[PDB]
Amino acid sequence: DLGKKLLEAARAGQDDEVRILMANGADVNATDASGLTPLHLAATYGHLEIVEVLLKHGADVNAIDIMGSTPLHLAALIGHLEIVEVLLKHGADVNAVDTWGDTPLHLAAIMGHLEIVEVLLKHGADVNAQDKFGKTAFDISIDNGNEDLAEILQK
Amino acid sequence: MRECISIHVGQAGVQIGNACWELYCLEHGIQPDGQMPSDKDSFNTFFSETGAGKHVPRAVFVDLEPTVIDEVRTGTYRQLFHPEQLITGKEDAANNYARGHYTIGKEIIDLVLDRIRKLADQCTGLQGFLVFHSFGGGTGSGFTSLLMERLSVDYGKKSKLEFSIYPAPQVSTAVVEPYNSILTTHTTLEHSDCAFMVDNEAIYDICRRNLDIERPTYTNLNRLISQIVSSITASLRFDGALNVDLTEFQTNLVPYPRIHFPLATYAPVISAEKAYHEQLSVAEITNACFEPANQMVKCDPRHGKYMACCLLYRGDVVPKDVNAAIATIKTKRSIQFVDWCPTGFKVGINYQPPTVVPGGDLAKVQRAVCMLSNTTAIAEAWARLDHKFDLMYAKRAFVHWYVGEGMEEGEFSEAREDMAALEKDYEEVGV
Amino acid sequence: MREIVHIQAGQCGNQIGAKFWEVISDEHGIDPTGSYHGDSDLQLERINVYYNEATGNKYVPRAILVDLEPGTMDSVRSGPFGQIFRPDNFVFGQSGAGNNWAKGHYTEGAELVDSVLDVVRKESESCDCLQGFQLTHSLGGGTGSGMGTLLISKIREEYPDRIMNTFSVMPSPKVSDTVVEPYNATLSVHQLVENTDETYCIDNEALYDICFRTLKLTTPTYGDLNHLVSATMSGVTTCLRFPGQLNADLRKLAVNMVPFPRLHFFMPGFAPLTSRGSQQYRALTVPELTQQMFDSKNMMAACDPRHGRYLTVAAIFRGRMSMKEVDEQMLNVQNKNSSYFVEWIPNNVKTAVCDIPPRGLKMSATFIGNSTAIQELFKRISEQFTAMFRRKAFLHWYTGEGMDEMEFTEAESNMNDLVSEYQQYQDATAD
Ligand SMILES: Nc1nc2c(ncn2[C@@H]2O[C@H](COP(=O)(O)OP(=O)(O)OP(=O)(O)O)[C@@H](O)[C@H]2O)c(=O)[nH]1
Ligand SMILES: Nc1nc2c(ncn2[C@@H]2O[C@H](COP(=O)(O)OP(=O)(O)O)[C@@H](O)[C@H]2O)c(=O)[nH]1
Ligand SMILES: [Mg+2]
After folding, report:
1. How many helices and strands, by DSSP H and E, does chain B display?
2. Chain C residues in contact with chain B using a Cβ-Cβ cutoff of 8 Å
3. Searching chain C, which residue's CA lies closest to the CA of residue B170?
């Protein structure tokens, strides 16, 4: 089964194995037990070159795992600015909501990724999107006392 | 003789002890090396005599850390005290009653008692003990209540008198002082025959108002206290007719064992900068004893009823002038005695004026008076403490420090209920 | 109690720990070769608390330097005071912790921990009366957090009757955007609530915001952040290092500061705020110092005190100033801001004055507060921990070191329980 091998090369950042596996029929949109695809895992571990390759060979930029996490949610959470941009350029849904009601904007705001926050706003991120507890990225800013984030959100 | 042994526990007890013994020496004409030039004695109640002509205080100083006692060991009175009667541990009770009573205190209690026994064994007719301590500190509160328990077993028939420092926020060192104050009062109540509380707030105010000291320090407070304590013990150290032994203090001032907290009032307290003050008559200083501002404890005797009242004069006081002054007090003032006590005043006159320590804040005066009275107004002092206890104890604030040091939480409630019964004891007398 | 054993673990721990020694050594008059060069008797009176006295008249820090990364050994030896530390007291590993708390707590750090206890044991057995331990470390890395919490736990089992105190620096994405830090901090806080008596929360969020918004430093460095830390650490330890009677030792500080066992995370503050070699703060008075002390901008934890209530406060004034004026202003701030102090802990603010100010200042004020507003710090970390933990990101880095996933839910649950306790006491009334 080349799917499991493609998931591990994608997580491990092995560019060479990724290309070889795809050349032998490996399912680019394979999933692990939680529903994470090679793209979800390359986006999580910061493997930009693998993210780009998967996107040129059929990867679903908006795939969701069992928890509604998209690759953009994970790139936004972990803080990979470059991957966030590549995903937005390939049609990633900036306003995708996961099982906790979080959008990527929420996750970038909580983790303090201010540059990613600016990027997501510039691409249409909904500032009124509320999580499961009714909080927007702006409320997170007020509640945490993050003046830097508040200022960025006020534009 | 009829000897008295003074025990000084903790920083407060020790520092006040140092100030008293300094005064006693000046009053009896004893030098800091213990020698006394050829004079004749009643001072023997408080000082032993060595074969070399040295007069040694019948005193023990105990603390769980050595800092304060080391000052005593190196100070002006370094040769006065028996060196084996200055006892110290290495580590203190951290403002925690439980530590002074249960854990740290138990490491030195047998040593302290064997040292008290060495003093006791040099006495012909030991009357009892004078114990000086703070309510608020860990040693002052916890070790003293351990010591008083042990003394009751070893010296059952002997009298025990206390001089206790009641907390004031202006000079308090701990938030838990209300707790320590209540835990020591509960455990020492049955072991103490008579207790003179000194309210640091009262003394602080007398220093500010009467002595013009902007920010009084312990040095100031202690010199004023030592002057009041000397007036209370003078009867034991000199010939006289009122309060001539420890038993007489209970007879005269404690009608019922539990309500054994006399209020002391002292006048005149004049600043050393007013050397040429016009001397105050007997009438004026006797009147001054009924003014709340001159009391050692903050409370209002006009809101209470008197059970006993002693007036201890020192100086140029003609007995007829005292009688005339008391006469005016009975007629003019609204001083209410309980119905079951003879509505009278016991009077003692010692005809030497008070002594003032060089370095002190007080002026020399020709006559002074210390009034000791057992009034129900003193229950205001307990109520103030009980209220602070109740605020912290309702949320169990700081209790873990105590239970973690060998104490059962249940002991907070037993002590507090004993304090509720004490407040009622005063209510039932004075209504 | 006299001696404190100081431990510094990890990069942050050593960096801030090295600065601590450089700053207090200047205040105590110790040159970088350990010789005394001071012109005041107060500088040596309590020197034994942090320095061991060596062969010559040479003082040596009672410090243990620890890290799994050897590179930090070199950084510390290169400093001015790098040669003052005992060489036998540098305990270092081969491979670092990789910012993984599990490597510090369970694998690499557990191999080295025994080696460290041998140096602690040597230092502790040389002490006349060991007071306790002091640790400096970060909660966001691996060595300081994972190994430091391991060390704390192994020290508490050997020396259970001693005080364990930490200077724990909290992570912030503003200073280090390594996203596993909330995991490391949360796992550390769980250890800290159970095994320390006193922890000073030094929040990098607040250190960054002070440098950036107040000191107008466009690009704060760790040197700028550490300048604030060293000034705070000098302030909070003043009472332990100079003669005094309030909070003079770790245990008395703890009984006054900690009303409930788990609520022992203090929010320190300092005034005036200053940058490295600016000397801007000059015209600063007692009322200004007193108001600045209680301002949010002066707090070393990113918490607004006006969003909670103070359970206890210890304030330390340093310099030549009127004790009367300090009494007055401190009372004024409590009356003016009555709503920010819990009513059920009477006289919960304690004030100390030390005559010696810090280096480069004539007047200074340090604030040590136990405020329910500290829950804003924990809620911030909790939220970041939950964001990450929900998606299970990088959990394999921890479970791969034999760490059970339920140790994460237990830490999270404990931290959430801690936040709920602060709110319980913030809403509690006297009634
Ligand atoms: N009047 C007066 N009060 C004092 C003196 N020293 C301390 N106090 C008060 O006593 C209380 C503290 O008790 P301390 O005697 O200092 O403590 P301790 O008995 O040595 O007990 P630990 O230090 O806890 O072991 C506070 O209310 C202080 O204000 C003193 O010299 N005179
Ligand atoms: N204030 C301050 N924070 C530091 C310093 N060095 C590292 N940190 C913080 O410590 C955390 C990383 O911990 P670190 O000590 O480097 O890892 P360790 O060496 O494994 O304990 C991050 O939150 C850093 O921002 C320093 O000198 N000062
Ligand atoms: Mg003491």
Report:
1. 15, 12
2. 1, 128-129, 245-246, 249, 251-252, 254-256, 258-261, 311-312, 323-324, 327, 343-348, 350, 425, 428, 430
3. C327
